[PDB]
Amino acid sequence: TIKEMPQPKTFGELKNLPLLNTDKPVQALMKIADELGEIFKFEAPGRVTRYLSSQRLIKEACDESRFDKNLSQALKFVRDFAGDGLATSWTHEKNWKKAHNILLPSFSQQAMKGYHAMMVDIAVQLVQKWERLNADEHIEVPEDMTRLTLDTIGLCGFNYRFNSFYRDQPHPFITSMVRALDEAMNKLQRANPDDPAYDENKRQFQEDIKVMNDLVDKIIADRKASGEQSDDLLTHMLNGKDPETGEPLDDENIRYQIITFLIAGHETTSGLLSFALYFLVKNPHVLQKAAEEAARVLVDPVPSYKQVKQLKYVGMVLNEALRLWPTAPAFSLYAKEDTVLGGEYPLEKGDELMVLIPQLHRDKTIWGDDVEEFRPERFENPSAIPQHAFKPHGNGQRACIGQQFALHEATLVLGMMLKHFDFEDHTNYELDIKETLTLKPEGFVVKAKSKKIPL
Ligand code: HEM
Ligand SMILES: CCCCCCCN1CCC[C@H]1C(=O)N[C@@H](Cc1ccccc1)C(=O)O
Ligand SMILES: C=Cc1ccccc1
C-alpha cells in the first residue's frame, strides 16, 4: 500500500526553498499542510525532508527505537554559537549524554524548591512595575514577559541580575540574540550563503555572537571569584561529575551550555506567557475561572512552592496555550534504519522528518471539531489523550530538559498576575505572530486594573 506523498510548488533548481522566503515560514508551512494533508515532501538543493502533521504518523515518528533527533538546518545554524550544548548536539556525541547526566539533577523537584524564592523575586518586580503604571498607560506584553523570563533564568541559574526591569530598551544580550535568530531564520532560504552580498550579514552575525560570549565571560568570572556559596545550575556545570564517563564538563562545553540555557531557558517561556494572556483576555470565562483559583490558593503575600503546585487550572491554561501555539514550533528526526511509516511511506536509513507541532495540535481526529477553541478542560484527564497527540516539549530522551522549570515559572507568574490585576483588551488586538525560529505575539498590548492587594 505504498503511497506517493504530495509536494508543494517548486522553483526550478531551487526546488521548494523559496517557499521559506517569508518572515513567517512556520505559518506558511501550516498553510501548506492545510492544503496537502498529513505528510508532504520538501526539497532544497542537496536536501530532502518530510513534514508530518497528523497524530497517526507522528506517534510512529516518536518511537525512539526507529527515529533519533536530527539537527534541522535551523539548529545547525544555531550551533554556530551554541556548539555542542544540550540542544544542538547529536545524541551520539559524547557531550550530549555526559551533560545530560550532569545537569538533570538541576531540574529535580528538590532543585525547583531551591529556585522558587528567586523566581518570586523577579515576579514581584513584574507586579510592582504594573502597579506603578499611570491611568490609561498600557502594558507591552511580550516585551515585559521577556524581561521576566530572561531575568529569571539569569538569577535562578547563574546568580546574575540582568535587571531588565531597569531598562526601557532590551538588554544587549536580547538585542544580539534576536538578531542572531533572525539571521539564522533568514539564512534558511539563502541559496548562495557565501555570495559577497552577505558579507555584512556575516560580520553582524559574528558581532552578535561576541556580545553573547562577552556576557558569558562575566557570568563565569563573577562566580569563580564570588565568596557566596551557590547551589544552582552553574554550580552543577562547574562541579558535577558524569556517573557514566566519570568526567566533569570542560570549559569549552560549559560556555556552550550557558549560551544554550540563557536562550532556551527564557525565549520560549516568554512566548508561552504572552500567548496565555492573549487567550485569557479573549476568553473572559476562562480568565474568571483561573482568577478564582488564584484567589483561593494564593492566600499569602508571597506565593510558596506548595501553593504553585496547587494552581492546577492555571496549569491547564498553560497547556492549552501550548496546544494552539507551541513556542518551539518544530523538531526534526532521522530514521535509524529502513522502516515504513504508517504502512504507506517507506523510508531509508538516514531519511529525515520534520514534526510540525502547531498542525499536529490541530488534528481534528484527536481534539474534535472545536479544535480552534481555547478550552483548558481538554487536559483534565491525560489518560483520555491518545499517545503523542501533544508534543510542545519534544520527544523521548531528547525532550526539553527545562519543562518543569518553565511550567513552574509560568504557573507562578500567571497566578500572581491573576491575583493582583483585572485585564482589558482595550485595542481589540488582532493576533500577529512574529517568527524568530521561535513564535511570539507581536504588538500585543493590554491595560491592567489593580485589585489593590498588597505584596
Ligand atoms: C514553554 C517553554 C519551553 C518550550 C515550549 C520548550 C520546548 C522545547 C522543545 C520542543 C525541545 C526539543 C527540541 C528538539 O527536539 O530539537 C526543547 C529542548 C530543550 N530545552 Fe526547552 N522548552 C521550553 C523551555 C525551556 C527552558 C526554560 C529551558 C531551560 C531551563 C529549556 C532547555 C532546553 C534544553 C537544554 C533542550 C535540549 C534538551 C536535550 O536534548 O538534552 N527549555 N525544548
Ligand atoms: C529553536 C526552536 C525551534 C527550531 C525549529 C526550527 C523550525 N524552522 C523554523 C523556520 C521553519 C522551520 C523549519 O521547518 N525548518 C527547516 C527548514 C528547511 C527545510 C528543508 C530544507 C531547508 C530548510 C529546517 O530548519 O531544516
Ligand atoms: C531548544 C532549542 C532552542 C533554540 C533556540 C531558541 C530556543 C530554543
Q: Give 52 Cα–ligand 2 centroid separation in angstroms.
A: 13
Domains contained in the chain, CATH given: 74-342+398-450 (1.10.630.10)
318, 407 Cβ separation under 8 angstroms? yes
Sheet holding 330-335, edge to edge: 39-44, 47-52, 352-356, 330-335, 67-70
Identify the residues whose C-beta falls under 6 Å from ligand 3: 78, 87, 263-264, 267-268, 328, 437-438
Tell whether residue 156 is among the known ligand binding residues.
Answer: no
CB of residue 111 inside a 6 A radius of ligand 1: no
Q: Give 260 Cα–ligand 3 centroid separation in angstroms.
A: 7
**Rounded to the nearest 5 degrees, what angle is found at the Cα of 288, between the Cα atoms of 287 and 294?**
90
Phi/psi-derived region of residue 241, left when phi > 0, alpha when psi is between -120 and 50, beta in every other case: beta
Helix (H) or strand (E) holding 434: strand 433-436
List the one residue out of 248, 217, 229, 218 whose CA is nearest residue 114: 229
Identify the residues whose C-beta falls under 6 Å from ligand 2: 25-26, 29, 42, 44, 47, 49, 72-74, 185, 188, 328, 330, 354, 437-438
Report the C-alpha gap between 370 and 330 in whole angstroms: 23
Q: What share of the chain is helix, strand, coil (3-state, %, to 5)?
A: 55, 10, 35
List the one residue out of 218, 120, 115 whose CA is nearest residue 162: 218
List residues in the chain that are followed by a break over 2.5 Å (C to N): none
CB of residue 58 inside a 6 A radius of ligand 1: no
Kindly give the number of the ligand 2 atom that is closest to the alpha carbon of 354. Answer: 14
Tell whether residue 115 is among the known ligand binding residues.
Answer: no
List the one residue out of 277, 341, 324 whose CA is nearest residue 141: 277
**Alpha-carbon distances of 210 from 126, 193, 217, rounded to whole Å:** 29, 21, 10
Collect all residues with Cβ–Cβ distance below 8 Å to 378 and sequence separation of at least 6: 316, 320, 323, 367, 385
Please report the resolution in angstroms.
Answer: 1.6
List the one residue out of 54, 26, 60, 61 whose CA is nearest residue 364: 54
Residue among 93, 357, 400 whose CB has most ligand 1 atoms within 8 A, to mutate: 400
Distance of alpha carbon 77 from its chain centroid, rounded?
17
Q: Give 328 Cα–ligand 3 centroid separation in angstroms.
A: 7
Torsions phi, psi of 23, nearest 5? -80, -5
**Please, which experimental method was used?**
X-ray
CB of residue 97 inside a 6 A radius of ligand 1: no
155, 121 Cβ separation under 8 angstroms? yes
Report the C-alpha gap between 449 and 377 in whole angstroms: 27
CB of residue 263 inside a 6 A radius of ligand 1: no
Render 260-288 in DSSP notation, one character per residue.
HHHHHTTHHHHHHHHHHHHHHHH-HHHHH
Render 222-269 in DSSP notation, one character per residue.
HHHH--S---SHHHHHHH---TTT-PPPPHHHHHHHHHHHHHHTTHHH
437, 74 Cβ separation under 8 angstroms? yes
99, 85 Cβ separation under 8 angstroms? yes
CB of residue 360 inside a 6 A radius of ligand 1: no
Q: Give 452 Cα–ligand 3 centroid separation in angstroms.
A: 38
Cell of 157: 541559574
Kindly give the number of the ligand 3 atom that is closest to the alpha carbon of 436. Answer: 6
Torsions phi, psi of 113, nearest 5? -55, -35
Which residue CA neighbors atom 8 of ligand 2 most closely? 437
List the one residue out of 269, 327, 265 whose CA is nearest residue 85: 265
Q: Give 280 Cα–ligand 1 centroid separation in angstroms.
A: 24
Kindly give the number of the ligand 1 atom that is closest to the alpha carbon of 391. Answer: 10
Report the C-alpha gap between 281 and 423 in whole angstroms: 7
- Which ligand sits nearest to residue 48's alpha carbon? 2
Q: Could you give the count of Cα atoms lying within 13 Å of 182 in the half-sphere of its Cβ?
A: 13
Which residue CA neighbors atom 6 of ligand 3 most closely? 264
Q: At what angle do helices 312-324 and 284-297 cross, to 10 degrees?
A: 150
Residue among 21, 266, 354 whose CB has most ligand 2 atoms within 8 A, to mutate: 354
User: Residue 373 carries which DSSP code?
Assistant: S
Q: Give 72 Cα–ligand 2 centroid separation in angstroms.
A: 6
Report the C-alpha gap between 257 and 175 in whole angstroms: 20
Q: Give 6 Cα–ligand 1 centroid separation in angstroms.
A: 31
- List own/partner pairs for 405-408 with CB under 8 A and 24 or more apart: 405/107, 405/112, 405/115, 405/156, 405/265, 406/268, 406/269, 406/272, 407/315, 407/318, 408/112, 408/115, 408/116, 408/119, 408/308
List the one residue out of 375, 272, 365, 363 whose CA is nearest residue 325: 272
Report the C-alpha gap between 258 and 214 in whole angstroms: 12
Report the C-alpha gap between 376 and 70 in whole angstroms: 32
Cell of 431: 493576533
Q: What is the dihedral of CA 171, 121, 239, 215, to 10 degrees?
A: 10
Written as one letter, the residue type at 183 is E
Collect all residues with Cβ–Cβ distance below 8 Å to 41 and sequence separation of at least 6: 5, 6, 7, 48, 49, 50
Written as one letter, the residue type at 77 is F
- Which ligand sits nearest to residue 29's alpha carbon? 2
- Which ligand sits nearest to residue 20's alpha carbon? 2
Distance of alpha carbon 122 from its chain centroid, rounded?
19
Report the C-alpha gap between 446 and 346 in whole angstroms: 50
List the one residue out of 327, 314, 316, 331 whose CA is nearest residue 272: 327
Written as one letter, the residue type at 220 is I
Written as one letter, the residue type at 196 is P
Residue among 71, 75, 149 whose CB has most ligand 3 atoms within 8 A, to mutate: 75
Q: Which residues pair with 442 in a beta bridge?
A: none
Q: Which residues pair with 49 in a beta bridge?
A: 42
Report the C-alpha gap between 76 and 88 in whole angstroms: 7
Written as one letter, the residue type at 135 is A
Strands 352-356 and 47-52 come out as parallel
Collect all residues with Cβ–Cβ distance below 8 Å to 94 and sequence separation of at least 6: 245
User: Residue 443 carries which DSSP code?
Assistant: S
